[PDB]
A paper describes a structure:
The matrix channels at ND2 and ND4 seem to be closed under our experimental conditions, whereas the one of ND5 is open. One is located at the tip of the membrane arm at ND5. This half-channel has also been seen in complex I from mammals and Yarrowia lipolytica. In our structure, this channel is connected to the central aqueous passage while proton leakage from the open ND5 matrix half-channel is prevented by a 5–6 Å gap between ND5 H257 and T315. The B14.7/C1-FDX/lipid arrangement stabilizes this loop together with an amphipathic helix that runs towards the main ND5 transmembrane domain at the tip of the membrane arm.
Protein complexes of the [name] respiratory chain assemble into respiratory supercomplexes. Here we present the high-resolution electron cryo-microscopy structure of the Arabidopsis respiratory supercomplex consisting of complex I and a complex III dimer, with a total of 68 protein subunits and numerous bound cofactors. A complex I-ferredoxin, subunit B14.7 and P9, a newly defined subunit of plant complex I, mediate supercomplex formation. We propose that the main role of the plant supercomplex is to stabilize its components in the membrane.
Numbering used by the authors:
A (entry chain g): 30 to 108
B (entry chain l): 37 to 54, 70 to 125
C (entry chain o): 8 to 87
D (entry chain m): 2 to 71
E (entry chain L): 1 to 589
F (entry chain i): 2 to 16
G (entry chain T): 39 to 121
H (entry chain j): 9 to 59
The structure:
């Protein structure tokens, strides 16, 4: 019967982040910190996710890897 | 669950942290005897010298005991 | 009992190093059949029997060899 | 009944405040002398001698003289 | 498809954990069971592809920790050993999820439980599939964490919290050992990659300075790794957490502490055999430890009164047989026995869970009895599991246990002799406690409460299905897989396991052993069954001694209280550190 | 045009 | 479900009726054991242990020593939620 | 179920009894068949290649 | 159950003589009959 | 600046740091104040950092820097958790709390995550630095690495004990009976800490790639071979 | 602004450094330190390339790896002795 | 009075000692039929001394009987699963009463 | 119990019986399948099979990395 008869919780128990819902038809009023923090978070995501994948790879490992390949080639082909 | 006891006497210094019929050093002695059983069995196996009564010669692989196949000089 | 399987054949058949003994020329067909038959135990019965007889004979020869050495340990003891 | 603040228990607070003021109880006893001598002086010296020897054993394993320290 | 195997249980756990409020018990039961079952199906396909098809799979996602030579990566390795462990883990996990659907049906918090089961499954998969030591360490710690979370699932119970903390701390002592071993591996080889290390392991001969001592580097590394194995497989040093882990719900005991996670040490020794083969000293240490553990757990289990306790001490003894099989250089046999134990021990834990559920959560065998007719199916499942465990001829446990005992007999060394003796006597002890459990639970005149008998019921279908499948496995899997895994000269393992020629003893064990040696397991098992029958049915005064003799009473206590191992450790070690923390470090300094 | 090529050029400008 | 006072009364009086010294004619739900039934207080301890087995309860030793009558045992068993 | 002086014992489900009987019967038959097929080999009377 | 105490406790245990709670050793080897009969039929069949 | 003195004093630094890790971890074990437990934990972590940096190789210095950053995230988050508890209940004594999982499950989950991070659980940011420092130390001195790896056992002990005494068990309504889980501001505050911990834990390459040249030149400074 | 492409450095050790007295040309001393660091990274990258060969020979050759990987194993283990800043000095 | 209370306190000690000895007799016997004889024998120990009138001797016998219980006590006694120390104890307890959950805490206003 | 009905959790708390749990379960299953598609594609791209299988296998349909590591001397 637990699989054929629907549950009884019309609405869940508790309120997400313990805030009571707004009056019917109304919207929750945003606290003053919300918009600046959300815009900062969006800009952080955009800046890191684009600039980190867009900046040139200048790591010493990458430069030395290409240098190592060509030295093993120059020494293998020649004797 | 039922009703947590609320202290009515001064707590001791070591109360944050506070095996019934055997003693402490007695339990240590019984456990030491138990481990001495294993020690005695090991010494008995030494005295047995089972390695000296093996009923077959050691195996001998071909190709110089698989010298090259085991990473030796070709 | 002389070695029949060459090194090349044993490497091509990918024999575990510990099964590169005098009986490997029979292990090769047995492992081919075992792979073809999904290693079912009621399968490959002739190949397996032949290979196991070979291995048993190897062990028996090493047992007789050890029987000879152990009867010279006594010779040394009774002559000392 | 009223408030999220915890209802203080006098013995629990006495225990906590006694924990916060232990330095007023130190008395330079025989037990304290032994505990400070063993754990405050001897054991650090033993650990230091262990670390140094480890380097010296590496030094002699590499065919090198003992590295001077401190 | 190979990534799906690893990450499907993670997806299921994530949906049950983050969105369980939208699915409830039923949704979360379905979501988690489906995802693990699909992973199990893909695991079977991978077994067909990799082991039967002889086509290993290698998958590298990204670097994890790259610092100069240090090369830990998110990489997956699928060879024969890997797919064998995959089948074991995914199949047992699917069955346990299905069983839990009905076993936890009245529990208030089933979605969290299912999420924890799935996260454990994911971490175990990460463990067995890693291609380097660091991913393996991640799996090691993850299964430790999931085990801790499941042991104290009933968070209000003080016994469960203590048991979970104890399990985490013992496992951390092993993880210490394992991490030191990994550091040594990197220092010697300049890598943590399994393939590179195994390709190089035969070359190094250098000595190392470890704690002001000059030791062989390979031997030091192998012993340090074995310390982590000792932790995870509850061997002699670090064994006491396993019996207390019974505080968790029965499905956790079946899946985590009997089939998959408790065997991680055996798996790691088998996977690192190309390294362990060049440390004879470490192999001797392993041989001794496994043997001692089998005897310890066997002697402790014969006086336990709780069903789950008896079955946990059984697991510990069986893990000892598997460790010394590895120590005598027979890894294929140890992995075969691991796969075989995962069927019978899971059948035994789930059957015991069915009995406990039917008896209103009574777990004491002294308040049971006369239950064979009331629970026919459960009694039959327990019989089959017990017969397979004791090594009854031609059942699943018969094909690996006696081969290990014959191989120990054939190891003509001091530690080989030690292991042969201890395993032989442990066979008698395990037969005794298995038949004692059967007799006390089902066959003696009933010692139970009327209110328990009058409220009994056998397994609901989501519980009986896994029991049937595990009974079939415990009957046929041994015979069916024997030639593939340990058949003379088999190539099934390919390059996953390494036995050096000088250590090969399987032919001499099948051919040079006196016929008697092969029968001592049946003879000891028969004697143990007979002694159990006499003690638990025709003894009316072999209990006066424990009430009138001081020496017999202390021995009864010695063995019932696990050799006083927990008492001694807590009294001399845990209390010592706890007292230092307040009296020296804080108050004197 | 493409986001990333512009982003490449902008990052190069800033360096 | 809970057990009805009646069921408790019946099964407690059945337990007391099985005692050999007790004659199964003067056991009411209000008889006292050392006054009406002619029993020593060790017999009372045995009867309390029998009631304990009969309902699967674990009475604390302080409370078990207080039960000295059929009525006392009846009220303890019906008020216990796990009977 | 059958009630005997207070205690009532419920008869098990028929398919449960049948499944237990049949799986054990299968196990007993499997043991007998395996013993006949490869018991002289474990006893050591003969060898698998004998013939 | 000779003493008054043991006699009382044996009297209370009368329900333990329940028909299907007792003599359970006869139920210890379920299918031993069907399995043996099937083996016999198979053996006879193998004769032909 | 003083590579020769740095070499001469290396055993001294190793000894001081190893003593600090063991003794301070054991003192942590016996603390009864939330903030006192989190504060003592930082002493053990920073002395591990010193062992790493005085190992004078890539693993050591890289791990020291990574653990510095990871500690800066993790200890800050832990202080934030304790502050969430103190703002409501105004007590730091562990004995008053207990059973909070049943009234503050969101706080309990976040607190558990940062508790795991403080134990250097693989997958978290602190494990990367911890293990890289152990790698760096082992290559120089196996004893110091062995004493420093004891932290894995002691830090687990106190972290799990704290978490289970605060969150697990039953409520004690005679001390606390009124509760509130995290509001939106507190959840948002925790989000970047979680993201950073996981990000460094699973893909520390973004950080290590920007640091290797500087770390390498620091390691080489004073020598020319 | 920076041009697109991989970083460029001088192939050669700086002319102006005296190994006898390295604290004599400070600019040359700094340049020599950076050059040595770059050279050390080239040796690390060489040992990493040789490790990929061993990894794949083990994987491809299976049980024949002992005889097939022998030269690659020797090369890798020789490159790893005195690599970077680990357990070997120069 | 005082001699009545002092004799009454002794009676309680004997009744509780007997209860615990009897429950432990079942832990060591397991089967019902062995319990019958063991319980009969324990009851005979108490009955032999049932008729003593000297009060100091009663105290000495009580102390001896408690010491005997504490030595020959079964190491792993049976406990009903929901009783304290039981396997089911404090599993899924009913929540305590008097718990309030507050909404809209920590607002900027 | 009584107060737990006012306590919000992600896993739903005790005895969670959402009214639309079937439709929610179906939506979760569709989400897991959609998430699994890219994982399967990436796995097929990343798999490396140095050895041809003895018989044809399902991975040969989607994975084209069979017998590619033969020249391990050129690995980098
Ligand atoms: C030979 C092997 C030598 C090396 C190993 C020696 C270790 C043997 C341990 C013997 C002592 C074990 C603990 C002492 C308890 C004991 O031996 O008696 C057991 C039985 O233990 C054995 O029989 C030995 C195990 C089988 C070995 C043969 C009876 O247990 P009870 O709980 O009293 O059950 C009695 C049932 N009833 C109360 C209803 C009357
Ligand atoms: C990456 C994907 C990982 C996916 C794992 C799913 C995590 C599950 C969410 C947390 C569970 C939760 O919500 O907390 C429950 C309870 O909170 C806790 O128990 C706190 C512990 C949370 C444990 C979560 C950790 C999961 C382990 C994964 C570790 C992540 C890996 C680390 C390395 C990155 C809520 O309470 P309840 O519904 O069970 O009802 C009980 C209520 O309290 C009173 O009745
Ligand atoms: C039960 C299983 C227990 C597993 C660990 C037990 C260790 C027993 C070691 C005995 C064998 C042994 O002595 O081998 C040594 C190897 O070094 C070692 O064994 C190193 C052991 C160090 C592991 C302990 C880790 C804790 C940190 C360091 C503590 C050290 C103090 C000792 C407690 C020397 O063998 P060999 O190298 O010479 O080979 C050639 C042998 N002739
Ligand atoms: C669930 C959430 C888990 C969050 C973890 C994301 C991990 C993604 C994988 C990593 C990856 O590949 O990225 C490399 C990738 C480039 O990799 P490369 O090409 O190999 O260099 O870069 C990214 O895409 C960066 C990720 C963008 C967003 C970062 C998250 C920012 C949130 C706040 C961070 C912490 C703030 C506190 C201040 C810290 C100061 C120390
Ligand atoms: C190393 C030193 C170990 C002893 C240290 C303790 C010293 C001490 O005070 O002890 C006195 C110890 C108690 O000291 P106390 O606490 O001061 O009374 O003496 C005893 O009463 C115990 C010793 C006698 C009883 C144990 C005999 C050994 C039995 C072993 C049986 C093992 C069977 C395992 C299965 C085999 C098959
Ligand atoms: C074996 C397959 C599962 C069979 C379960 C049926 C249970 C039953 O008969 O219901 C009665 C059963 C209880 O009835 P009773 O056992 O007759 O008392 O109801 C349930 O509680 C089970 C019904 C839903 C739970 C099982 C199905 C949900 C999990 C599905 C997982 C699918 C994985 C495989 C998919 C591909 C991978
Ligand atoms: C495994 C455990 C070991 C076994 C433990 C062995 C215990 C020792 C057995 C003997 C102990 C004693 O003599 S214990 C003391 C002996 N008895 C006395 O106190 C004097 C008698 N007077 C009385 O008060 C009552 O007759 C009384 C009998 C109490 C009835 O109480 P009621 O007036 O309420 O019916």
């Amino acid at each position: 019967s637990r699989w054929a008869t629907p549950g009884h919780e019309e609405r869940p128990k508790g309120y997400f982040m313990n805030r009571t819902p707004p009056a019917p038809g109304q919207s929750r009023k945003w606290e003053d910190w919300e918009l600046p923090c959300y815009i900062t978070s969006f800009l952080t995501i955009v800046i890191l996710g684009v600039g980190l994948n867009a900046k040139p790879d200048l790591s010493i490992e990458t430069w030395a890897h290409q240098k190592a390949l060509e030295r093993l080639e120059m020494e293998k082909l020649a004797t | 669950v039922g009703k947590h006891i609320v202290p009515d006497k001064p707590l001791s210094v070591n109360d944050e942290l506070m095996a019934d019929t055997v003693g402490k050093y007695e339990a240590l002695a019984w456990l030491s005897g138990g481990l001495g059983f294993f020690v005695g069995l090991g010494l008995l196996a030494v005295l047995n010298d089972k390695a000296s009564k093996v009923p077959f010669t050691p195996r001998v692989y071909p190709y110089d005991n698989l010298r090259v196949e085991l990473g030796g000089e070709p | 009992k002389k070695m029949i399987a060459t090194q090349e054949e044993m490497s091509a058949a990918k024999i575990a190093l510990g099964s590169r003994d005098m009986c490997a020329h029979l292990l090769i067909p047995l492992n081919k059949c075992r792979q073809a038959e999904f290693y079912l135990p009621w399968k490959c019965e002739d190949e397996r029997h032949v290979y196991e007889k070979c291995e048993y004979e190897l062990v028996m020869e090493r047992m007789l060899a050890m029987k000879k050495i152990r009867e010279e340990e006594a010779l040394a003891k009774q002559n000392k | 009944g009223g408030g999220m603040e915890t209802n203080k228990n006098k013995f629990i607070e006495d225990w906590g405040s006694a924990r916060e003021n232990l330095e007023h109880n130190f008395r330079w006893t025989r037990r304290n002398f032994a505990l400070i001598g063993i754990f405050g002086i001897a054991l650090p010296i033993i650990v230091y001698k262990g670390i140094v020897k480890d380097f010296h054993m590496q030094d002699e394993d590499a065919g090198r003289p003992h590295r001077k320290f401190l | 498809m190979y990534l799906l195997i690893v990450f499907l249980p993670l997806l299921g756990s994530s949906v049950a954990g983050f969105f369980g409020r939208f699915l409830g018990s039923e949704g979360s039961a379905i979501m988690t069971t489906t995802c693990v079952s699909f992973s199990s199906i893909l695991s079977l396909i991978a077994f067909y592809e990799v082991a039967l098809g002889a086509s290993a799979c290698y998958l590298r996602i990204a670097p994890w920790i790259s610092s100069e030579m240090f090369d830990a990566s998110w990489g997956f390795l699928f060879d024969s050993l890997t797919v064998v462990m995959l089948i074991v883990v995914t199949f047992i996990s699917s069955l346990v999820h299905l069983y839990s659907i009905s076993y936890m049906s009245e529990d208030p918090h089933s979605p969290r439980f299912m999420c924890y089961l799935s996260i454990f499954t994911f971490f175990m998969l990460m463990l067995v599939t890693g291609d380097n030591f660091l991913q393996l360490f991640l799996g090691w710690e993850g299964v430790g964490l999931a085990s801790y979370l499941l042991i104290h699932f009933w968070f209000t119970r003080l016994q469960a919290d203590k048991a979970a903390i104890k399990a985490m701390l013992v496992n951390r002592v092993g993880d210490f050992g394992l991490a030191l071993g990994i550091l040594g591996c990197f220092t010697l080889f300049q890598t943590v990659d399994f393939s590179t290390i195994f390709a190089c392991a035969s070359v190094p001969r250098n000595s190392w300075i470890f704690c002001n001592m000059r030791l062989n580097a390979i031997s030091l590394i192998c012993i340090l790794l074995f310390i982590g194995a000792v932790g995870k497989s509850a061997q002699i040093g670090l064994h006491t957490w396993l019996p207390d882990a019974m505080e968790g719900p029965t499905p956790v005991s079946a899946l985590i502490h009997a089939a998959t996670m408790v065997t991680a040490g055996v798996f790691m020794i088998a996977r690192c055999s190309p390294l362990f083969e060049y440390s004879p000293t470490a192999l001797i240490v392993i041989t001794f430890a496994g043997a001692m553990t089998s005897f310890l757990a066997a002697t402790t289990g014969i006086l336990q009164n709780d069903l789950k306790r008896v079955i946990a001490y059984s697991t510990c003894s069986q893990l000892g047989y598997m460790i010394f099989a590895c120590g005598i250089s027979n890894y294929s046999v140890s992995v075969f026995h691991l796969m075989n134990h995962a069927f019978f021990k899971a059948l035994l834990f789930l059957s015991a869970g069915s009995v406990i559920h039917a008896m209103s959560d009574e777990q004491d065998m002294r308040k049971m009895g006369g239950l064979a007719s009331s629970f026919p199916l459960t009694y039959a499942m327990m019989l089959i599991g017990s017969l397979s465990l004791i090594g009854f001829p031609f059942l699943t446990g018969f094909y690996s246990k006696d081969v290990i005992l014959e191989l120990a007999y054939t190891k003509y060394t001091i530690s080989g002799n030690f292991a042969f003796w201890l395993g032989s006597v442990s066979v008698l002890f395990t037969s005794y406690y298995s038949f004692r459990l059967l007799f006390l639970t089902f066959l003696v005149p009933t010692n139970s409460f009327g209110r328990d008998i009058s409220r009994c019921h056998d397994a609901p279908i989501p519980m009986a299905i896994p029991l049937i499948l595990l009974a079939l496995g415990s009957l046929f899997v041994g015979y069916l897989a024997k030639d593939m895994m340990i058949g003379l000269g088999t190539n099934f393992w390919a390059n996953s396991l390494l036995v050096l020629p000088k250590n090969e003893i399987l032919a001499e064990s099948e051919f040079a052993a006196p016929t008697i040696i092969k029968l001592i397991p049946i003879l000891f098992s028969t004697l143990g069954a007979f002694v159990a029958y006499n003690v638990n049915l025709v003894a009316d005064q072999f209990q006066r001694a424990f009430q009138t003799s001081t020496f017999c009473n202390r021995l009864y206590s010695f063995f019932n209280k696990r050799w006083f191992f927990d008492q001694v450790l807590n009294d001399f070690l845990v209390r010592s550190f706890l007292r230092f923390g307040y009296e020296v470090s804080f108050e004197a300094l | 045009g493409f986001i990333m090529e512009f982003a490449e050029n902008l990052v190069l400008r800033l360096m | 479900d809970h057990l009805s006072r009646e069921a408790v009364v019946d099964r407690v009086l059945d337990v007391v009726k099985s005692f050999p010294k007790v004659d199964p004619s003067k056991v009411t739900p209000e008889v006292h054991f050392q006054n009406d039934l002619g029993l020593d207080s060790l017999d009372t301890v045995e009867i309390v242990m029998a009631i304990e087995e009969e309902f699967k309860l674990e009475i604390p030793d302080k409370e078990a020593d207080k039960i000295d009558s059929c009525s006392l045992a009846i009220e303890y068993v019906y008020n216990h939620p796990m009977s | 179920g059958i009630t005997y002086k207070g205690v009532t014992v419920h008869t098990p489900k028929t398919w449960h009894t049948v499944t237990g009987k049949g799986l054990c019967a299968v196990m007993w038959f499997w043991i007998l068949y395996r013993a006949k097929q490869d018991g002289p080999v474990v006893m050591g009377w003969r060898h698998p290649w004998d013939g | 159950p000779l003493g008054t105490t043991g006699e009382f406790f044996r009297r209370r245990d009368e329900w333990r003589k329940h028909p299907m709670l007792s003599n359970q050793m006869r139920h210890a080897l379920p299918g031993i009959g069907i399995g043996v009969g099937a083996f016999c039929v198979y053996l006879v069949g193998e004769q032909i | 600046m003083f590579p020769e003195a740095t070499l001469c004093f290396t055993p001294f630094i190793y000894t001081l740091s190893a003593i600090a890790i063991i003794y301070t971890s054991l003192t942590t074990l016996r603390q009864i104040d939330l903030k006192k437990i989190i504060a003592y934990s930082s002493v053990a972590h920073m002395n591990l950092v010193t062992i790493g940096m005085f190992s004078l190789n890539i693993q050591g210095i890289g791990g020291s820097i990574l653990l510095m950053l990871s500690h800066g995230l993790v200890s800050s988050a832990l202080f934030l958790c304790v502050g969430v508890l103190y703002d409501r209940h105004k007590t730091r004594l562990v004995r008053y709390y207990g059973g909070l999982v049943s009234t503050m499950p969101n706080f309990s989950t976040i607190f558990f995550f940062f508790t795991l991070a403080n134990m250097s659980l693989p997958g978290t940011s602190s494990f990367i630095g911890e293990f890289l420092i152990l790698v760096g130390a082992f290559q120089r001195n196996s004893l110091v690495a062995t004493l420093a790896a004891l932290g894995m056992i002691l830090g687990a002990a106190y972290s799990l004990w704290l978490y289970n005494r605060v969150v697990s068990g039953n409520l004690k309504p005679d001390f606390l009976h009124k509760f509130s889980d995290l509001n939106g501001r507190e959840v948002f505050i925790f989000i970047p800490f979680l993201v950073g911990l996981v990000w460094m834990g699973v893909y520390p390459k973004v950080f290590l790639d920007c640091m290797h040249t500087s770390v390498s030149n620091l390691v080489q400074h004073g020598k020319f071979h | 602004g920076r041009k697109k492409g991989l970083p460029e450095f001088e192939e050669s050790a700086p002319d102006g450094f005296d190994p006898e007295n390295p604290y004599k040309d400070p600019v040359a001393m700094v340049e020599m330190r950076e050059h040595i660091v770059r050279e050390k990274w080239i040796q690390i990258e060489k040992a990493k390339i040789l490790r990929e060969k061993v990894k794949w020979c083990y994987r491809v050759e299976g049980v024949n790896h002992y005889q097939k990987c022998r030269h690659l194993v020797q090369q890798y283990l020789d490159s790893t002795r005195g690599v970077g800043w680990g357990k070997d000095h120069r | 009075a005082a001699y009545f209370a002092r004799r009454a306190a002794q009676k309680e000690r004997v009744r509780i000692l007997y209860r615990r000895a009897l429950k432990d007799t079942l832990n060591w016997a397991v089967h019902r039929h062995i319990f019958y004889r063991d319980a009969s024998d324990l009851r005979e120990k108490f009955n032999v001394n049932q008729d003593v009138e000297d009060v100091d001797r009663i105290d000495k016998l009580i102390a001896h009987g408690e010491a005997e219980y504490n030595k020959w006590r079964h190491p792993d006694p049976y406990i009903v699963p929901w009783a304290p120390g039981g396997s089911k104890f404090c599993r899924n307890p009913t929540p305590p009463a008097g718990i309030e959950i507050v909404y809209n805490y920590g607002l900027e206003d | 119990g009584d107060f737990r009905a006012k306590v919000w959790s992600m896993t739903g708390g005790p005895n969670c019986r959402p009214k639309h749990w079937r439709r929610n379960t179906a939506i979760a299953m569709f989400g897991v399948f959609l998430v699994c598609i890219p994982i399967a594609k990436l796995s097929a791209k990343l798999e490396q099979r140095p050895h041809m299988p003895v018989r044809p296998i399902p991975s040969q349909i989607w994975c084209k990395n069979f017998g590619t590591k033969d020249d391990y001397e050129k690995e980098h």
